[PDB]
Structures are given as C-alpha cells and as structure tokens.
C-alpha cells in the first residue's frame, strides 16, 4: 500500500489468462479516534418542533460524549420538507396562512432543501442555526427525505465534508419519504440526474427533477463515503428499519417519546459503525468475476459483503479475495463501506 493507513494493500496488479484463478488477502485495520463530520438534516414539519427543541442539547451533552470516541467533531445543519409543487404542498395562498396560524409556532415557506450551516467546530454556530430555524409543512404525510439526502451527499464543497474524516449524516424525521415515482402526481417525470444543484444553498431542481430511487441514493452514499443514521420518532421507525437491507451502510435509531435519547442515538450508532466492517466491489471490467470471503477476528467465516461485526481497533479484518476470468476482450476497486480509503485492483 504505502499510502492507505486502513486498507492494505492499496494497489495490486493481477495478470490473468482465462480458466485460471488468482487469490489475495486484503487486511482492513480500523483506526482509533477518527475525525468526525456530523451533518444534521432535519425534517422541518410542525410535528418535529419538540425534536428541534432537543437539538439545543447537542453542543453540551453530545459533544462531551463524542470527545471520548473521536479526535475532531464538526457540525452542520440542513432542512427539508418536500417538493414545492402541488399536490404535495398547497398552492392556494390563504390556505398557507391558515395553516401557519394554526400551529402557534413561527413558520416559513416550505422548501425542498436548504443548506443552513456548513461543517464547523463552533457549537455556538450550531446554536445560531437552531434558534433561527422555523417550521414549515406539506399537505400529504411523506416528506422529501431521500431527495435532500442526495443533495447533502454529492455537494461536497457546499456541505464542506472532509476527505480525512468519518462522515455521518443524521437524518431526523418522523414520517416516511417519497420515492422516485411519486413525482408523477406533480407531472415531474424527468429522472433525478444525481449532480449537485445548490445555487445559493437552496436546491434549485426541487420542482423539475424527481426523487431519487433507492439505487440512485445508495450509489451516491457509498461513492461519497457517507454514513447515514436515521433518527425516526413515531411509528415509522419500522419503515426505515426494513429498508436497511436495501441501503447498505445505514443505521436506524428510534427517537423515544420525549426525545430523551437523541444524544445516545448518535453515540450508539457511531459505536455500531466502526464495529461493522463489510466490503463491496465495483466491477467495471467484463469477463471477470470476484469472490470475496470474510474472515472475522472471531474466526467465523462470513461472505465478503456480509462482513464482520464486533470489530474494534487493533483488529485486522481479513478479506480473502478470489478473482477468476471467463473470456478475453481497466481496473476494479474493492472498498469497505464507510471508509475514506479504497483498494485499486488492476487487471
């Protein structure tokens, strides 16, 4: 390797004539005390106001706990409701004002996605971002969650993620989210392209392009090394809990009744994140099959994408990679889910 401190090796060149199998082991050695970038993405609905109340305790209670696990801690903030076209929101003017005046809370126009605070180590800027924050809403119950998760993922110089950091994305909601083909009720039929579209920290394709699919979302969370934690309050925790097999590398935590465990939710999910090491291969060459086997430090032999749990640091998880060839006619990259460094395998 000689560059990567976590995955070794970093570059192996394999020459194959077909009908022959090659074989190598790749060690994953976790670090202790990563730098951590935690970006909150909060549902701005009126039901979420006790939860934005409890975001006040982030700079006091959470940042003290995360010093015992991390070496840096930078906080960001974002806000989503839903796409701002009908039938999602109400396009009638005084129905909005009746709807704002009902909640006896400060309200603002609903929005697709507004990036509020970049990643910073000032907790007094996080407390500015919370007390400035107001309420919005749509009419139907699902929200524009996955649409804002992709904009908080691909926009790197706007969110301000660090390459050399453990990137966490706490999604914070209580309803479900719209899917890629809910958009046809609004006549939104051009598919989500997957590029960054923040003009002035406001997502400006929120009424033209559609919601992402789960495959569109998951390929952007893994390419951008972003670890997603869902903090879901009501009965829809079980919805996001059942999408976790479709979204590899996502953790789901249930906010309790009085939201008393928000600071515990980030601590416990960050513990489960460095404890689990699994891999996946991006194969863009034809005629080449990979076959990766996970050897746990427990000794239990699991598949490669299943990975090994209960991993601490000073453990070196081994992935016995076997590659074959079927026919003749470029490189493949085998990377662990949630790490900044990859492994480049030339053919």
């Amino acid at each position, epitope marked *: 390797n000689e560059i990567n401190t976590q995955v070794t090796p970093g570059e192996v060149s394999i020459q194959l004539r077909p009908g022959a199998e090659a074989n190598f082991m790749l060690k994953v050695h976790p670090l202790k005390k990563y730098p951590v970038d935690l970006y909150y993405l909060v549902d701005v609905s009126a039901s979420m106001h006790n939860n*934005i109340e409890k975001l*006040n*305790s982030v700079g006091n209670d959470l940042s003290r706990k995360m010093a015992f696990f991390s070496r840096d801690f930078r906080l960001g903030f974002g806000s989503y409701v839903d796409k701002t076209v009908s039938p999602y929101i109400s396009i009638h003017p005084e129905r909005i004002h009746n709807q*704002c*005046s009902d909640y006896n809370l400060d309200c603002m126009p609903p929005h697709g996605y507004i990036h509020v605070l970049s990643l910073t180590e000032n907790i007094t800027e996080f407390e500015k971002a919370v*007390h400035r924050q107001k309420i919005s809403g749509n009419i139907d119950t699902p929200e524009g969650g996955f649409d804002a998760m992709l904009q908080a993922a691909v926009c790197e110089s706007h969110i301000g993620w660090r390459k050399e950091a453990k990137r966490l994305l706490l999604v914070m909601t209580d309803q479900t989210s719209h899917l890629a083909l809910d958009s046809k009720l609004a006549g939104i039929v051009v598919p989500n392209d997957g590029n960054c579209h923040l003009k002035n920290n406001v997502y400006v394709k929120s009424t033209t392009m559609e919601h992402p699919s789960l495959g569109q979302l998951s390929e952007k969370l893994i390419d951008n090394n972003i670890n997603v934690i869902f903090a879901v309050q009501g009965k829809q925790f079980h919805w996001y809990k059942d999408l976790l097999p479709l979204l590899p590398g996502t953790i789901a935590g249930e906010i309790e009744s009085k939201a008393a465990n928000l600071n515990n939710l980030v601590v416990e999910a960050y513990q489960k994140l460095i404890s689990e090491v699994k891999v996946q291969v991006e194969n863009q060459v034809q005629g080449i099959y990979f076959n990766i086997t996970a050897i746990c430090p427990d000794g239990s032999r699991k598949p490669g994408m299943e990975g090994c749990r209960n991993v601490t640091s000073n453990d070196e998880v081994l992935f016995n990679v076997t590659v074959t060839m079927k026919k003749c006619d470029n490189y493949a990259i085998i990377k662990p889910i949630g790490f900044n460094e990859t492994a480049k395998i030339h053919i």
Partner: antibody, heavy 119, light 104 residues
Framework: EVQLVQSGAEVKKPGASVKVSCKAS????????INWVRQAPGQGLEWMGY????????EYNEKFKGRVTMTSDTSTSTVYMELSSLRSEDTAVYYC????????????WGQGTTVTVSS | EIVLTQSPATLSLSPGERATLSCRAS??????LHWYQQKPGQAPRLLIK???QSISGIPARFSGSGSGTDFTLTISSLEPEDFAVYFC?????????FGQGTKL
C-alpha cells in the same frame, strides 16, 4: 401561571452599569427564554436581547452590541441583564419577556424596573 | 432588520364605535405578527397571536386579519377600557422588532 418578578428601581450616573433581575416562577419547563425590552419615556418598545434557559444561549441586538450581557442563576431561576457604559439616553423602564421555544411571542412580562441616569 | 410601519400614529374615536389599526411590514412575515395592548403604567399585554388567533381570557371584540406585509387589528365595539397604545411585533427573524404604536 408564570410570574416574572424583577428587581427594584435604579439610578446610576453615566458611564456605569446596572444589573436587573427577573426571577421566573410558576410553571418553568426549561424550554423558555427570557427577553428584555426597553420603553423609553414617550417612545415605542425596544428589543435588547434573548437568553435561552436550556443552553444559556444568547441572542443580542446589534445596536446594543458590546454593551449588553445576560447571565443567569439555575437553581433560583433568576436571569440577569447587565447594561454597561450607560448614557443619559438609556433612561427607561425595563421589562423581562418570557417565550417558549419556536414561538417568539412574549407570553409573560411581569412588572417593570425604572432606570434613571444623570446626576 | 424588519421595519414595521404602523398607521395612524394617533386615532381619536368615541366609545362604542369600531376601530381599525393597520400595520405594514418590510417583507413577508407569513402570519408572524402579534398584537399587544399597553395601558399607561403597565406592561404590554398580548391580544392576538399569529395575526388571527385569540388569546384566552380576552373578550372577543379584538380580532385581527392579514398576512405577508399588511395586517390589521379590528375592535368591534370600542369599549372605554380599550383606549391604550397598541403594538405590532414581528416574530419572523432576529432582531425581534416592534411597531411604534398607535394611541387611541
């Protein structure tokens, strides 16, 4: 209900300071913030600042910036405001206003305190 | 800074009549406006929250309407105790601001 009780009336020469009290009582649920507002004699109400009780987080007015400081006492639930570098144009009656989180309207006010300045 | 301009400055009426008090804004506050009553010698007392909701314990001649920029406060039968100075209060953004008041 919530009774906000302040300190007594004050008088203080220019270039000094004054520390007014506002003891929250009644129903305190820790999600509130105590404001202060200035009513100069024969002029409208004037926003000075905000102090959230959960964090100790402050929000100030830019006209008053560098002259106003708000601290608190947790066990007695008494929140303090300290104006410094007083001038003769700061002569007014000071109220303390209580919110709850998210709704920045002034639900409770209490009595006033009268600050006089010159000589 | 959201400047709240309130008109008229003073408003001389008779007991039993109906009074209207306008209040404009510098930008859109979407029913983020509250109304206060201040008798002389007392603290301001909130009358209407979020431009149309009635505070409990207040006699329902005080009813407001408006949104965005231009909001109003309407007294049905101008009782003799209603004569005070009335204030607007923007709650849309920091700094919190007031209007200058309308004597009555």
């Amino acid at each position: 209900e919530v009774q906000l009780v302040q300190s007594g009336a004050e008088v203080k020469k220019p270039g000094a300071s004054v520390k007014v009290s506002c003891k929250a009582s009644g129903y305190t649920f820790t999600n509130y913030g105590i404001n202060w507002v200035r009513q100069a004699p024969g002029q409208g109400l004037e926003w000075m600042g905000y102090f959230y009780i959960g964090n100790g987080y402050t929000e100030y007015n830019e006209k008053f910036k560098g002259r106003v400081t708000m601290t608190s006492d947790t066990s007695t639930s008494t929140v303090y405001m300290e104006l410094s570098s007083l001038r003769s144009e700061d002569t007014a009656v000071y109220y303390c206003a209580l919110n709850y989180f998210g709704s920045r309207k002034f639900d409770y006010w209490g009595q006033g305190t009268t600050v006089t300045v010159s000589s | 800074e959201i400047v709240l301009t309130q008109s008229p400055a003073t408003l001389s009426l008779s007991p039993g009549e109906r009074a209207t008090l306008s209040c404009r804004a510098s930008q859109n506050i979407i029913t983020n406006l509250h109304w206060y009553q201040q008798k002389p010698g007392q603290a301001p007392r909130l009358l209407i929250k979020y431009a149309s909701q009635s505070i409990s314990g207040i006699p329902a001649r005080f009813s407001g309407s408006g949104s965005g920029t231009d909001f109003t406060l309407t007294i049905s039968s101008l009782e003799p105790e209603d004569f005070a100075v009335y204030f607007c209060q923007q709650s849309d953004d920091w700094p919190l601001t007031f209007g200058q008041g309308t004597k009555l």
